[PDB]
Amino acid sequence: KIIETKMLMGEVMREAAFSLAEAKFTAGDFSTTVIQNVNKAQVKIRAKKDNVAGVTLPVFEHYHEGTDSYELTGLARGGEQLAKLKRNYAKAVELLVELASLQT
Amino acid sequence: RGKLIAVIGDEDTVTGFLLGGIGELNKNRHPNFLVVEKDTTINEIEDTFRQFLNRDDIGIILINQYIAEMVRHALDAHQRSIPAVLEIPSKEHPYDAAKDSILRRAKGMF
Amino acid sequence: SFFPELYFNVDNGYLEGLVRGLKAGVLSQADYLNLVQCETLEDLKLHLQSTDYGNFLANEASPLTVSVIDDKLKEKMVVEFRHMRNHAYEPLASFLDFITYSYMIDNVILLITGTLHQRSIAELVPKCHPLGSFEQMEAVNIAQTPAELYNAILVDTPLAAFFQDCISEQDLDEMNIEIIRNTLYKAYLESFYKFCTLLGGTTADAMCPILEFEADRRAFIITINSFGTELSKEDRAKLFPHCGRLYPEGLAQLARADDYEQVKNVADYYPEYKLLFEGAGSNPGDKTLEDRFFEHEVKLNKLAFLNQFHFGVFYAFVKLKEQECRNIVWIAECIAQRHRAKIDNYIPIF
């Protein structure tokens, strides 16, 4: 299954990367604010144990910690594209979390 | 609470995930991510990668494929399970497939 | 009035001819089509060389990337602007300074936050937008002390007057960085608008419509985007400029609104805007409201070039060329990522 997930990851990340292009088109240079203005995470990963057989394997589990992400309307107020961009990468992370568990 | 995801990648890749809600500062004001620019050298990338491996705060590390090639020796040298490292296609570099560490671990997969 | 068309050409005659000569070099619809028919970044370079663009990616890295062409496009127009800004006299130079102020504001927002999270100025300056410049010291080598940056700004930085809304430093630490920058920009628009009305000739009539649009356009988008966040309705209202068509009555409704539908009902009173909300189908695979606003803004900035004796031609020039850069980068990005069906999302600039 890990191969099919790797395949899917390709397509999902492509869409997320394109969505970024749209956000940049509208907003201009939002990457500078996002990278510098970082403090707390909204997404965190909790370790869990899966007893697949006699062997016990470490699996990751997605944890939506709940702390709010930064709200940015400063550049061209490109809020909608940034909002769709958050969603696309949010989903990408969830796939990747699954992906890391599958490497186990 | 348990584990953070560290990101080492280019400007657009890191920006995207940060908006994804992942990534934060540590209590020592260290960041669990690196933005890799054209002027960033190999020693700085590797030092960051290793330090994440030696940190208990992280775990999953997300890197760009082209980076995986830049410091590839550091990806095979450490074999454990904390550092689950996922290799993702950069905005322009094309879809990854070959030279995947896991694909190599198993030599029975197309 | 008889105010322009007489003394105007004495000092500003050259610049008017030059800037319209520069406008002539903007990509036409025929040229954009030639750029779309590439599917390769190197071919994109080759086709660009057919216009006033080109020969600026020479001597760069053999492989061409989107980030490189983006930075270079900015630099080209920055040089053209700085040239016109340098060969200018106070009657016009003050107008151009307002344009630069918009970029300075963004840059000082960057200087704070970084100062608030111990980062050195020398590390921050390389990522400041051109035209900010900040040739003055004291803003440099602040020793990562917020007070030193706030003192240097109050004294040396032309934006000092605007910060009168956000003062005492306490504001810098307690206010969200985005509320601070939106507040400061509103102050900018208010002063700049009044300045344009002091120049009560063709410039006021040709320029103010553009500023009035920006005021109302931001009020609309701010109201909508603010729905999903935590912000007091009164504090949101504090961010609405009063130089626009919503000021008499209308902003009061947006300040109370809690839904897109109510925002549209406000637009319903202004056919010039209602058409934008109706055109912004907002379907899962269509243009949105921001896209229609860009198309409208370009219409306005292009109409600015119908008056031959004013300063509004220089403002419109910058905005149209900035959109030109956005359009070119969009094409380069669509090529790199191979999303050919999305190529026709550029904003035509005639």
Side-chain angles (χ1 to χ4, degrees):
Chain A
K1 184 175 180 180
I2 195 168
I3 300 300
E4 290 178 354
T5 300
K6 185 179 176 68
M7 179 183 72
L8 181 60
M9 179 276 288
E11 184 65 20
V12 172
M13 291 303 293
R14 182 182 187 194
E15 182 65 21
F18 181 76
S19 295
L20 185 149
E22 289 180 354
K24 187 177 289 185
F25 179 80
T26 298
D29 191 38
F30 65 88
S31 66
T32 299
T33 299
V34 172
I35 293 168
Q36 183 174 283
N37 192 6
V38 178
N39 185 33
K40 301 292 184 182
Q42 180 173 4
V43 177
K44 296 188 180 183
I45 307 300
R46 294 185 294 173
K48 182 176 180 180
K49 294 182 180 180
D50 186 352
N51 295 330
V52 72
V55 67
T56 299
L57 304 176
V59 297
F60 292 96
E61 182 178 59
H62 187 282
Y63 180 51
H64 192 95
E65 197 274 336
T67 295
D68 288 343
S69 66
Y70 292 96
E71 179 66 21
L72 304 174
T73 60
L75 303 177
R77 281 79 171 91
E80 182 177 359
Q81 293 83 344
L82 290 171
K84 290 179 180 178
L85 181 59
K86 287 181 178 181
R87 291 185 182 94
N88 286 339
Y89 267 98
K91 289 179 180 178
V93 171
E94 291 175 354
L95 187 149
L96 291 168
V97 171
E98 182 175 5
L99 184 54
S101 294
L102 293 172
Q103 292 179 332
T104 299
Chain B
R1 182 199 64 78
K3 301 290 183 183
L4 304 176
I5 302 171
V7 179
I8 302 168
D10 66 11
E11 182 178 330
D12 288 342
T13 300
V14 172
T15 299
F17 285 122
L18 289 172
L19 291 173
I22 185 71
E24 64 178 26
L25 299 175
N26 185 278
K27 69 182 181 181
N28 64 7
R29 306 294 297 169
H30 290 195
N32 61 336
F33 62 92
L34 176 66
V35 178
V36 179
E37 297 181 354
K38 74 179 181 69
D39 298 330
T40 296
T41 190
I42 298 300
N43 290 342
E44 291 177 353
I45 294 166
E46 183 177 359
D47 285 345
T48 298
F49 178 78
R50 185 175 63 253
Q51 187 64 50
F52 288 153
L53 269 58
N54 288 331
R55 180 173 291 171
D56 305 12
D57 310 26
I58 325 305
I60 297 169
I61 302 168
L62 304 177
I63 65 171
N64 291 123
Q65 181 182 9
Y66 76 90
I67 293 169
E69 291 297 296
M70 291 174 70
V71 294
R72 174 63 68 189
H73 73 278
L75 274 60
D76 294 314
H78 297 260
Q79 295 293 313
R80 293 179 66 193
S81 64
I82 292 166
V85 179
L86 307 178
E87 299 185 27
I88 59 171
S90 69
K91 181 178 72 175
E92 296 179 354
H93 188 281
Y95 179 54
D96 64 301
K99 304 184 182 179
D100 186 291
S101 64
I102 299 301
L103 183 60
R104 184 179 66 80
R105 182 181 66 195
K107 295 181 180 179
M109 297 180 181
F110 181 78
Chain C
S1 72
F2 294 71
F3 287 1
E5 299 178 354
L6 294 172
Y7 289 97
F8 185 88
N9 289 32
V10 172
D11 297 312
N12 294 304
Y14 177 79
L15 292 171
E16 181 67 21
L18 176 60
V19 71
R20 285 176 172 275
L22 291 168
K23 182 260 266 181
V26 302
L27 293 173
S28 69
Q29 184 61 46
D31 296 305
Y32 279 109
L33 293 169
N34 189 60
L35 297 174
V36 170
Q37 299 297 300
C38 294
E39 300 183 354
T40 299
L41 292 173
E42 290 70 18
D43 289 344
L44 179 62
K45 179 177 71 175
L46 179 62
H47 290 194
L48 286 167
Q49 288 174 274
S50 69
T51 67
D52 286 349
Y53 282 96
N55 309 324
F56 64 87
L57 298 175
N59 310 319
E60 295 293 319
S62 294
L64 178 65
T65 64
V66 173
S67 65
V68 172
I69 197 166
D70 188 359
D71 287 346
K72 293 286 192 181
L73 292 167
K74 289 184 175 66
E75 289 179 354
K76 181 178 173 65
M77 78 178 285
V78 170
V79 171
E80 289 175 349
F81 178 99
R82 288 173 65 194
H83 175 72
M84 290 188 286
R85 172 63 183 79
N86 289 335
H87 294 261
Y89 298 93
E90 178 179 354
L92 185 150
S94 293
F95 182 88
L96 293 174
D97 285 345
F98 277 102
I99 292 168
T100 59
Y101 288 0
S102 68
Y103 296 104
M104 291 178 183
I105 292 168
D106 283 343
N107 286 334
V108 297
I109 295 298
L110 182 62
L111 294 173
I112 63 170
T113 300
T115 301
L116 294 172
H117 294 284
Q118 296 296 286
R119 298 293 300 276
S120 176
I121 296 297
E123 293 176 351
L124 299 169
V125 170
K127 295 182 182 295
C128 293
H129 188 284
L131 309 177
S133 296
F134 302 97
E135 299 85 348
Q136 65 272 22
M137 294 300 290
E138 294 295 296
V140 179
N141 301 332
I142 65 170
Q144 295 78 282
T145 299
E148 291 295 313
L149 183 58
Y150 177 74
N151 288 335
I153 292 169
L154 181 61
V155 175
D156 296 299
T157 300
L159 296 174
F162 290 154
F163 285 94
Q164 186 64 51
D165 288 344
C166 299
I167 60 170
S168 301
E169 294 179 22
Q170 181 178 8
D171 285 344
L172 294 172
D173 293 288
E174 294 179 354
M175 291 175 69
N176 189 300
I177 296 298
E178 292 298 296
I179 298 300
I180 293 166
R181 76 194 300 170
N182 290 336
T183 300
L184 292 172
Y185 196 81
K186 185 256 278 178
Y188 160 74
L189 291 173
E190 293 290 311
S191 180
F192 184 23
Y193 182 83
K194 289 179 181 178
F195 179 78
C196 294
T197 61
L198 291 171
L199 300 177
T202 300
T203 299
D205 288 341
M207 184 62 225
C208 290
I210 294 166
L211 292 173
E212 291 176 356
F213 171 79
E214 183 177 359
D216 292 334
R217 184 265 300 278
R218 290 180 184 276
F220 284 123
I221 299 298
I222 292 166
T223 302
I224 294 166
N225 286 335
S226 64
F227 286 152
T229 191
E230 182 180 359
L231 176 64
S232 297
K233 291 185 183 190
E234 295 76 9
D235 287 342
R236 181 171 66 178
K238 290 175 189 168
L239 298 176
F240 292 154
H242 297 170
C243 299
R245 298 173 70 195
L246 298 173
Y247 176 54
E249 181 177 358
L251 292 175
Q253 291 177 333
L254 293 173
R256 290 191 296 273
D258 288 310
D259 195 278
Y260 180 79
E261 180 68 14
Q262 291 173 305
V263 174
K264 182 178 178 181
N265 284 340
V266 173
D268 191 55
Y269 292 95
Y270 302 76
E272 292 81 0
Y273 297 127
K274 182 177 178 179
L275 292 170
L276 294 172
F277 286 70
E278 291 297 350
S282 304
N283 293 302
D286 206 336
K287 291 179 174 175
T288 190
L289 182 60
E290 289 80 359
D291 297 313
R292 296 301 188 184
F293 271 129
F294 285 123
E295 291 175 352
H296 186 95
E297 186 176 4
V298 171
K299 182 178 178 180
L300 291 172
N301 287 334
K302 183 59 65 174
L303 292 174
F305 280 78
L306 294 172
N307 294 277
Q308 294 176 359
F309 301 92
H310 63 129
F311 297 153
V313 72
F314 299 98
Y315 178 101
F317 170 80
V318 172
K319 294 302 190 186
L320 290 169
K321 187 162 279 293
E322 192 183 65
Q323 185 63 51
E324 181 181 55
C325 291
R326 289 187 182 94
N327 289 343
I328 294 168
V329 171
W330 180 244
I331 291 168
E333 191 69 74
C334 290
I335 292 168
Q337 295 179 304
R338 276 76 172 174
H339 290 286
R340 298 298 294 167
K342 300 296 184 182
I343 194 69
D344 290 327
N345 285 280
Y346 57 88
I347 306 301
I349 59 169
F350 298 91

